[PDB]
Symmetry: C3
Subunit: 344 residues, 3 copies
């Protein structure tokens, strides 16, 4: 909600409160999943060719007790400058540019968006990203959106590989960069490409048993159709030393594919059907080729209005239980989600 | 404070900042107790019959350092729909319906509200509650309200009894149900709850054994002519904590409070509270779990600022039960200055 | 931002989002340092001579992951009354009155303000402070301000020295009090004093620092006019200045000086020198430098809501047994920040 707009400065206090329950035979996901999000988004006019901005987004779990630990975290926190019509720069915790394309399939009622994770190189939300964007390809092509992003090393907790803000191997990165390019081809049809290259860290190449290599790389292509009450999107990503092999490390190579179809009825119901897979290749310890993710998703959202909705989502999990999924901690069970959400 | 009201949607950013200090011989409660609360309450008009709403309430302690852990937590987080005469429905972290009645005695300047706890079946705030409420009995009887409530299992951290949101035995529950009924300046109230207990509750702590946690509550309130009087009695089975040692197989909990509101802003308060545990294992037998007289006063400067003193006159004796279970037997004085928004 | 003002009550929701990176050979400070702050400040008119107020300020780190621990904390939380000319009183988590004067040199683009820390007696933000303030000496002497402050013990986690809100020896305190006095002659002078009981764990746990009381004495001078900022202050402490992780300095001498200029087009360069000199340290340490650097940097103000900055800590400490064992950083640091304020 816009709660301040005065003398060239604007502030939005926004969020949602999501009354959410999961039903699954997997006891690590079954049960109450209630949470909320709260954030601020602000803008300050500097001059005719310059606007300042900042955004913070917080996640607050509400499915555990008042004595539980580690229930809140920051999703986004960045500050930036917009340079007229010709671009922007921001720095902080923000989305990696790969998500410029992979966001197109991250539209399921509840599930989806899970062939990658957060703090996973530049695939999703990430610490310390400096992001340059231009929406007219340097004045040459209207509608052609370019991004270039740099990320500094976020290393180990201690020792030779450390930085101030250290973390475990699954969420480490070396210095890296990303780029994306997206374009509306026809009315309502868009195409996009993204690439990332990051140095890996010494702990990534020594602590977990899976995944070895100097660099983490991703290649993504996507398509979207959004018109006439119909939403279709597909994307394909090939990764190298970048996709998590559950708790066991990284996949030397992975091939990640998502497709989604939705329809918006004018009375407020939006059914959704999707297919997702992540195919790991050349895994160590005799694993070879393994499925990391494989499910059909069917669900629907009912929008009461712009501030209130309810939804059901059903993850039909096609993974077989085997020594890889067991050892890596990957859920092979179906899940049903039921939600009622207030947004502000 | 209402900070947004536009095109059918309203948002309140509300809270308080409570500069609070306790004086006690009990070193685990003595000292600075400053904290604040902040929350949002939102409502959206969907159509003539239907409004959607959400509420989040956060508690933020401010009595420890900037390197201290576990200083903030969510009290409430729920989303709901209100229908008209048909009632309301909400889901999330919210009050158990037993508090619809026991709240009538939870009005002391600082203390009170402590014969039960949070995440304690449906006695107070709870995870994963679905709550239906009906006002005026479908519009047929003015002042008659009722509620129906369901809670899904919140299990252990790992193993066979787990759920995603696992916790220790003290705050676990199986599937449960609660109901309340209140009727009106004089009011009477009843509440009942029934929850399945978990395998950890029946094996980890030494105290309390049974398949089910049950509560029965009756209460009365007089609120008129600047006088507030309230009393309630609750009988529980396998549901009242015996401090850190488990649950009381049975307990009998009683509270009574009297207050007067002077025009100039002073509100003195006198109360008596007790919790009596029966049939405790390990030789404990019958034990007092809580017993005190409370005297205090709140001074309201206005609707946004108050100050208060409260004096817990603790009538428990020190014994091996109070020591082992971590129950305070010392007197406490609280002094507070509070800003509300 | 003031987001509510109605029927005698007002509320400000304020903060900043600071996109911040450090470059250093010290791996414990090097890298992303992005964070934000958010708070509320409210006031309510009670009557002609009485206003109530409250403030909360929260710090939220954003430089680590979504599964990281302990990433947020309360800086300030207090409630108070202002009685016109008779003064104000507030209680909660608030600044110690020593900061009334030492804040004069806490103006660097990024660094500075580090000859003391938080929860460090009455040197900075502190739990359980009751603070009386009087502005312009009961309305009788423009520019003459004073404060009186009391702080109850904040003790150990358990045992005989416990309080409900226990913490480690570095952040403990006994009962104490403090006072400040400032006088505006754009030119000001200031004095502050504090005296606290030390706690048993401050004497029994760490290697360094022994004594029943912690005391500080501060004097400051400030020139702030004609686009020029010049400030200096000197503090002598007893059993009160941390000697890194090793304990406290039996005596310390802390000195800071800063000069800045505000150009009309927005740039504010800054040059400063800071040192903390510890004396009579145990275990053979004797006299040791606790802090010693020159700071050079600049802030560019786009407007009142947006700025960018660079800061360069030129660290004059050396690797020796003291800095090494105390965990005191000896390396240079460059900070680069972009900050949105609301
Ligand atoms: Mg490889
Ligand atoms: Mg029993
Ligand atoms: Mg000494």
């Amino acid at each position: 909600a816009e709660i301040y707009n005065k003398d060239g400065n604007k502030l939005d206090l926004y969020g949602k409160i999501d009354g959410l329950h999961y039903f699954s035979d997997d006891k690590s996901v079954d049960g109450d999943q209630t949470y909320m999000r709260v954030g601020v988004k602000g803008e300050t006019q500097i001059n005719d060719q310059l606007t300042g901005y900042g955004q913070w987004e917080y996640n607050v779990q509400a499915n555990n007790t008042e004595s539980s630990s580690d229930q809140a975290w920051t999703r986004l926190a960045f500050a930036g400058l917009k340079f007229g019509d010709a671009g922007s720069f921001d720095y902080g915790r923000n989305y990696g540019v790969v998500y410029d394309v992979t966001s197109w399939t991250d539209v399921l009622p509840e599930f989806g968006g899970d062939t990658y994770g957060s703090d996973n190189f530049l695939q999703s939300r990430a610490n310390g990203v400096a992001t340059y964007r231009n929406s007219d390809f340097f004045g040459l092509v209207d509608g052609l959106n370019f991004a270039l992003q740099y990320q500094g090393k976020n290393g180990s907790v201690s020792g030779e590989g450390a930085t101030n803000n250290g973390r475990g191997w699954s969420k480490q990165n070396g210095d890296g960069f990303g780029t994306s390019l997206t374009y509306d081809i026809w009315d309502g049809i868009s195409a996009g490409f993204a690439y990332s290259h990051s140095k890996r860290t010494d702990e990534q190449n020594s602590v977990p048993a899976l995944g070895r290599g100097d660099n983490a790389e991703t290649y993504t292509g996507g398509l979207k159709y959004d018109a006439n009450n119909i939403y279709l999107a597909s994307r394909y990503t090939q990764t190298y030393n970048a996709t998590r092999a559950g708790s066991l490390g990284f996949a030397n190579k992975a091939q990640n594919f998502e497709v989604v179809a939705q329809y918006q009825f004018d009375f407020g119901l939006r059914p959704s059907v999707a297919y997702l897979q992540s195919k790991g290749k050349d895994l160590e310890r005799g694993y070879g080729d393994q499925d990391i993710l494989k499910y059909v998703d069917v669900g629907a959202t009912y929008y009461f209005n712009k501030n209130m909705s309810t939804y059901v989502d059903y993850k039909i999990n096609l993974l077989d239980d085997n020594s890889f999924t067991r050892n890596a901690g990957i859920s092979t069970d179906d899940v049903v989600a039921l939600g009622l959400v207030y947004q502000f």
